[PDB]
A = this chain, B = another copy of it.
Amino acid sequence: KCTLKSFTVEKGIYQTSNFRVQPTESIVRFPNITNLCPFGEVFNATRFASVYAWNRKRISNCVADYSVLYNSASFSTFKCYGVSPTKLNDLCFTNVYADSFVIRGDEVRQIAPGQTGKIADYNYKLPDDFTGCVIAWNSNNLDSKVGGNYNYLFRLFRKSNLKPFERDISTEIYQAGSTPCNGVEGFNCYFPLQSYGFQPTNGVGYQPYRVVVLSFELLHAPATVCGPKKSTNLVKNKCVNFNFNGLTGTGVLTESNKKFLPFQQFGRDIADTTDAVRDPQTLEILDITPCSFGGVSVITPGTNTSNQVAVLYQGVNCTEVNVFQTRAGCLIGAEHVNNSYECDIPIGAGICASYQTSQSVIAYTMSLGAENSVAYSNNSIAIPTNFTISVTTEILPVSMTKTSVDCTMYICG
Within 8 A of B (CB), among A358-413: 404, 406, 408-409
The answer on a CB contact under 8 Å between A295 and B404 is yes
A66 at the interface (CB under 8 A from B): no
A18 at the interface (CB under 8 A from B): yes
* Number of identical monomers bound together in the oligomeric complex: 4
A324 at the interface (CB under 8 A from B): no
Chain B residue numbers with a CB within 8 Å of A404 are 295
**Considering only CB atoms and an 8 Å cut-off, how many residues of chain A contact the other chain?**
7
Name which residue of chain B comes closest to A15, CB basis.
B404
Q: Select which of B18, B406, B408, B409 is within 8 A of A409 by beta carbon.
A: B18
A293 at the interface (CB under 8 A from B): yes
Name which residue of chain B comes closest to A17, CB basis.
B408
Name which residue of chain B comes closest to A315, CB basis.
B404
Chain B residue numbers with a CB within 8 Å of A408 are 18
Chain B residue numbers with a CB within 8 Å of A406 are 18, 293, 295
Name which residue of chain B comes closest to A295, CB basis.
B404
Chain B residue numbers with a CB within 8 Å of A295 are 404, 406
Within 8 A of B (CB), among A285-325: 293, 295
Min CB gap A252→B, angstroms: 16
Chain B residue numbers with a CB within 8 Å of A18 are 406, 408-409
Name which residue of chain B comes closest to A18, CB basis.
B406
Chain B residue numbers with a CB within 8 Å of A409 are 18, 293
Within 8 A of B (CB), among A263-293: 293
Name which residue of chain B comes closest to A413, CB basis.
B273
Name which residue of chain B comes closest to A409, CB basis.
B293
Name which residue of chain B comes closest to A404, CB basis.
B295
Q: Mark A76-119, 1 if CB is under 8 A from B, else 0.
A: 00000000000000000000000000000000000000000000
Within 8 A of B (CB), among A10-45: 18
Within 8 A of B (CB), among A115-138: none
A–B pairs, 7, beta carbons within 8 Å: A18-B406, A18-B408, A18-B409, A293-B406, A293-B409, A295-B404, A295-B406
Sorted nearest first, the 6 A-B pairs with minimum C-beta distance are A18-B406, A293-B409, A295-B404, A293-B406, A18-B409, A295-B406
